Amino acid sequence: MRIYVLGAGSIGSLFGALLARAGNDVTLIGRREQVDAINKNGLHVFGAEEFTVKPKATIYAPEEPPDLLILAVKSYSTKTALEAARQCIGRNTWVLSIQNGLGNEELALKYTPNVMGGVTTNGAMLVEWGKVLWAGKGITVIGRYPTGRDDFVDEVASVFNEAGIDTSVTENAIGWKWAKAIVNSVINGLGTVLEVKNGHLKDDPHLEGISVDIAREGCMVAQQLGIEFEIHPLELLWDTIERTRENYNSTLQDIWRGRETEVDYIHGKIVEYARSVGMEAPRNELLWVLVKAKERIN
Amino acid sequence: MRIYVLGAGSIGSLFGALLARAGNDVTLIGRREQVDAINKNGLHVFGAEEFTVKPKATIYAPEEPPDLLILAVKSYSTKTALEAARQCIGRNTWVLSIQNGLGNEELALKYTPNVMGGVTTNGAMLVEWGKVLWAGKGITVIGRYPTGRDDFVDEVASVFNEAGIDTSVTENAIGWKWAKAIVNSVINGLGTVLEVKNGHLKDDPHLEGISVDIAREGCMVAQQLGIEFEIHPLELLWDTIERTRENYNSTLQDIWRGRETEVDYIHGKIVEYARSVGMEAPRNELLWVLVKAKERI
Numbered sequence A: 001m002r003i004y005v006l007g008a009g010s011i012g013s014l015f016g017a018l019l020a021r022a023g024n025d026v027t028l029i030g031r032r033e034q035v036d037a038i039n040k041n042g043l044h045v046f047g048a049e050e051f052t053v054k055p056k057a058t059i060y061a062p063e064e065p066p067d068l069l070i071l072a073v074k075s076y077s078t079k080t081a082l083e084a085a086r087q088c089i090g091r092n093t094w095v096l097s098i099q100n101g102l103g104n105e106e107l108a109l110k111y112t113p114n115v116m117g118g119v120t121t122n123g124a125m126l127v128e129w130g131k132v133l134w135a136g137k138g139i140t141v142i143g144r145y146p147t148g149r150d151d152f153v154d155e156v157a158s159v160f161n162e163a164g165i166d167t168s169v170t171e172n173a174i175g176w177k178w179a180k181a182i183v184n185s186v187i188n189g190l191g192t193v194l195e196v197k198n199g200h201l202k203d204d205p206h207l208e209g210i211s212v213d214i215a216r217e218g219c220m221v222a223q224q225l226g227i228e229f230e231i232h233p234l235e236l237l238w239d240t241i242e243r244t245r246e247n248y249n250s251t252l253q254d255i256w257r258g259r260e261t262e263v264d265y266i267h268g269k270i271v272e273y274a275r276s277v278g279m280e281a282p283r284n285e286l287l288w289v290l291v292k293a294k295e296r297i298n
Numbered sequence B: 001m002r003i004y005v006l007g008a009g010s011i012g013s014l015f016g017a018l019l020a021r022a023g024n025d026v027t028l029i030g031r032r033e034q035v036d037a038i039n040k041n042g043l044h045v046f047g048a049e050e051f052t053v054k055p056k057a058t059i060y061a062p063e064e065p066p067d068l069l070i071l072a073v074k075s076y077s078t079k080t081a082l083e084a085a086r087q088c089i090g091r092n093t094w095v096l097s098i099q100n101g102l103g104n105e106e107l108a109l110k111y112t113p114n115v116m117g118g119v120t121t122n123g124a125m126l127v128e129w130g131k132v133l134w135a136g137k138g139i140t141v142i143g144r145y146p147t148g149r150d151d152f153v154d155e156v157a158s159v160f161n162e163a164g165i166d167t168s169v170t171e172n173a174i175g176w177k178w179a180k181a182i183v184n185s186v187i188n189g190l191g192t193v194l195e196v197k198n199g200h201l202k203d204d205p206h207l208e209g210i211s212v213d214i215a216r217e218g219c220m221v222a223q224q225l226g227i228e229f230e231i232h233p234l235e236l237l238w239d240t241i242e243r244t245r246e247n248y249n250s251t252l253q254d255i256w257r258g259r260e261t262e263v264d265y266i267h268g269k270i271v272e273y274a275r276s277v278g279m280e281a282p283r284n285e286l287l288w289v290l291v292k293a294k295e296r297i
């Protein structure tokens, strides 16, 4: 399958390399550092698995329409990225977002109805240009956005599974995006504010309870928007916490590296949609302000 | 006036020493290190003004009823303190609480109807046994709890004013306790969580806005309990913040020293009354949990 990965960062390089090993026509689109590093010494994956591939790398999305375009930039870069890559979106090109936060798929829908949403539990960290750490293996869930199904979605899931990417298909992708967003609101909120590992958030009974509170806030916001959940975000919350006990959340890491966070598209979007349906959602807003303010004092 | 000060800490030693200087019959009650320091070399005030007085000091409240008993312990000790000093509460003994948080005056009312609530903007810090730093001068507001007025309250205010304690009388003391409590919710919440100076909460526009949100949460909680405000708490909030820009809030200081905080009686009480009246205080609750989590870490 012809696959372009827009955003050759961590998870983009992971997915790109995994898809590259299987024999797929993979093109990575990213920074000039990443592109040069890959073009001269290849892309190296280490950790959960260790190998070296040589996918095509470039800073410009090729003017030749792929079968699949994977959005792998951070949420604050999506809209520009799409504009920078719209020349590659052909009539049958499907757009898959494996990003966190909300609104990415809706941004993708401005170019084509062929859009699918996705969430991955895989951990990836680009430690060096041309070098990515597969921190952990996890399940990936993709589906036609917002709901339903399509043969090509099944085919993408088949290519992924073949490629060693454990993938299942949902008919409620938007519910997964929102569930993941709520879990992320709790974890990337509290964990970042208190600067603790994820497991801590369940171990402290008060933190556990307030986690529950935040979660039901997000859930009520989602359900008033006519979004239901195949799997309730609390089960996904305690599961995710159980899988990442030894990990500091990605937002806290972003603050630590001096990087920009995605909370404008996590807590921010939840607050936005809440306001869009006449609600307010206090906890997500307070967490949003706190995290942004913490980021400001680098 | 005969005044026993229960809790010879910072503000207790400040008020106690000022009242002793004025010529009042003042007795300080606290931990012994303080008692021994005062009984052996006296009480030393430095900072805003500097002087030395030697009031009576003891660890147990004398069995002879004072005209006025001042609560200057931390909010988590009040109940206990009240039980340990209950023998001095006579028929004409008035109890004045200058503590932060809520419920102190209600705790005092279990011993006597002679209770007045008070809030002070004065800054005080016990740096050493027998020495207290007068960090800043501020107005003191007292009144018969919860509302109304009384001649002895006016008299206490007169004694305070003559003692160099800038003091005014209110007919809405509970409203003042709640205003100060809301302001403290905002400041000791945000300021402690982010580990920033008070002024910062206004320098960052976002922190300012969310401060407004928290403050009005507290205000709605206060409003369902039938409590109105003589002056709006938000005005008092920015007032306090500009007067204390270079200062880290008392809760953050406590956490830095590893001391216990009073947030159970600030955010905790607000949440408590909110749930008790069928409401929700999400911001105050979340801040409560965050701060309570931060002391352990």
Ligand SMILES: NC(=O)c1ccc[n+]([C@@H]2O[C@H](COP(=O)([O-])OP(=O)(O)OC[C@H]3O[C@@H](n4cnc5c(N)ncnc54)[C@H](OP(=O)(O)O)[C@@H]3O)[C@@H](O)[C@H]2O)c1
Residues within 6 Å of the ligand: A006, A007, A008, A009, A010, A011, A012, A029, A030, A031, A059, A072, A073, A074, A075, A077, A080, A081, A082, A084, A098, A099, A100, A101, A120, A121, A122, A123, A124, A125, A126, A262
């Ligand atoms: N990392 C993980 O393990 C993981 C796991 C699950 C989900 N996710 C989600 O996947 C998304 C990506 O995360 P990430 O960790 O991979 O961050 P990342 O390493 O920064 O990946 C984004 C890359 O895409 C680049 N980029 C942005 N706009 C571009 C454009 N028009 N053209 C080409 N490249 C562009 C970025 O460059 P610049 O930095 O210069 O903008 C960056 O190199 C996030 O939303 C994340 O929540 C990540």
Ligand SMILES: NC(=O)c1ccc[n+]([C@@H]2O[C@H](COP(=O)([O-])OP(=O)(O)OC[C@H]3O[C@@H](n4cnc5c(N)ncnc54)[C@H](OP(=O)(O)O)[C@@H]3O)[C@@H](O)[C@H]2O)c1
Residues within 6 Å of the ligand: B006, B007, B008, B009, B010, B011, B012, B029, B030, B031, B059, B072, B073, B074, B075, B077, B080, B081, B082, B084, B098, B099, B100, B101, B120, B121, B122, B123, B124, B125, B126, B262
């Ligand atoms: N510090 C200020 O500038 C200021 C200003 C306005 C309002 N306030 C409020 O006033 C209250 C206390 O302030 P603070 O700074 O003075 O605290 P503080 O320095 O800790 O003083 C409290 C003292 O009372 C002692 N104590 C507790 N129980 C006692 C008991 N039965 N008998 C005798 N002593 C007892 C405490 O001993 P232990 O520590 O061993 O328990 C402590 O020494 C708080 O509610 C505060 O919010 C303070």
